[PDB]
Amino acid sequence: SGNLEGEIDISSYQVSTEAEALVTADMISGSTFPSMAYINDTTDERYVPEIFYMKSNEYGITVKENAKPAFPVDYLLVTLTHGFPNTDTETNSKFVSSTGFPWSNRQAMGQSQDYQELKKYLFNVASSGDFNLLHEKISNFHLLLYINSLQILSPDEWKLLIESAVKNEWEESLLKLVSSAGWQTLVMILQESG
C-alpha cells in the first residue's frame, strides 16, 4: 500500500483465532466504514449472542463495550514483520528466476505463454550447450509449470526435470534429461515450430 513517506513498502498480517472461528458461523460482514465490521441477526439457522470487545482505557482499566452495530477490526489482527535475506550470498533459493519467461495468466498484458516465447527463451541455450546456462534458464517456476502443462514429457521425464532444476546436484540429471528421448522430441519440435 505504501508507507508514511510515499513509498511502496509491504506489510504482512494474520487474523486471530477467534475471527477465524467467527466467520465460519457467518456472524460478520463488511461495513461501509472501512475500519469497522458489521454483525448479522439471529435468524432461524445462525444464532448470534451478544458480542463485547474488551479494551483498556488510559487509566489502565479494562472496559467492555457492547458492539452490536459495528466494531473496529483491530481486535481481529496480529501483525508480522517482513524482510529480505541479507546481502551475503547464501543462495538457498530454489530458483534463479522471476525475470524472463512470462508469468501465469497475465493474458491482459502482452505476457502470453506460447511456443514462440519458448523458442525465443529456452532454445539458444539448448542449441549451444553451456550446461550452467541451460540450468539457470531451466530453473524458472513458471517455465516448469508451463512445460508440464504442455504434457510432451512423460511423468518420469518431468520428475527428473524438476529435480534437475531445483536440486543443488544437477549435472548428471541435466545430462540425462538433455539426452532423454522426450526432451529430444521437445527440442526438435520447438526448433521446427516458428
Binding site: 449472542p49 451478544e50 463485547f52 467492555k64
Partner: protein, 224 residues
Amino acid sequence: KTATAILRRGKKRKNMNEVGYDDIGGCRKQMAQIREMVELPLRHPQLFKAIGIKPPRGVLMYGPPGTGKTLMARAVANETGAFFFLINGPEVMSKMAGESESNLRKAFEEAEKNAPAIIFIDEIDSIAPKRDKTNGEVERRVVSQLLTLMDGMKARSNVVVIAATNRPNSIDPALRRFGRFDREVDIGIPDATGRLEVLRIHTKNMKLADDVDLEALAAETHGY
C-alpha cells in the same frame, strides 16, 4: 369438584422429552393448578379475551427437594407443546462476570420472539436469593436484570414464566409482587395413595417377583 375441572378429558402429542402426565402421581391438586395456570393462557387464549381479563403468568412452585417440581414443569411443557426455554440457576450462575445477565436477556428475548412459550427458571433461589444473601455486585446485577425482564414481559402475553424453589423465603421478596411470581403452589409429601401411585410408576420395568405387596410398601413408607 370444580378445582380439578381441567384434569378431566395418541399420547404426548404423538430422553427427558418423553415425560408426561402419566409419569406423575399423587399430586392431583397441584397438577390441576399448574395446568389451569399454564395451558389455558396459551392453548385457549380466547377465553380471557371473551371475559375481558389478563390472566396471571408468574407461577412459583415450592416444596421439599425431590417432590417432583422439575418433573411437573417438564411434563406440563411437553404436554402443552409450546416453545419451552429452560433456565437453570447454577448453569446461569457458573458463567463469567457479565455473561450471566446477557444469557437471561437473550433467553427472554427468544421466548418473546417465538410462538406461545413457557420459560422454566429451575432453582430461581440460585440467581435471586434474599437480599441479605446477595453478596457482591454481580449478584445484584443479575437480580435487577431478572426483575426488569419480568416487569417488561407483562404486556407481551402468550408467554408464561414458571419458577421452582425449595422455600418461599429463599427468594428475593421483590419477586413476589403484582406482575411477578404472584401465584404460588406448594408441593407436599404424598399420602398413601400418592406413594402407591409413585411406586407403580417406578416399578413398571423391573422384573418384580410375584410376591410383591406394593400396597404394603406404600403403607410402610411414610414421609417418603
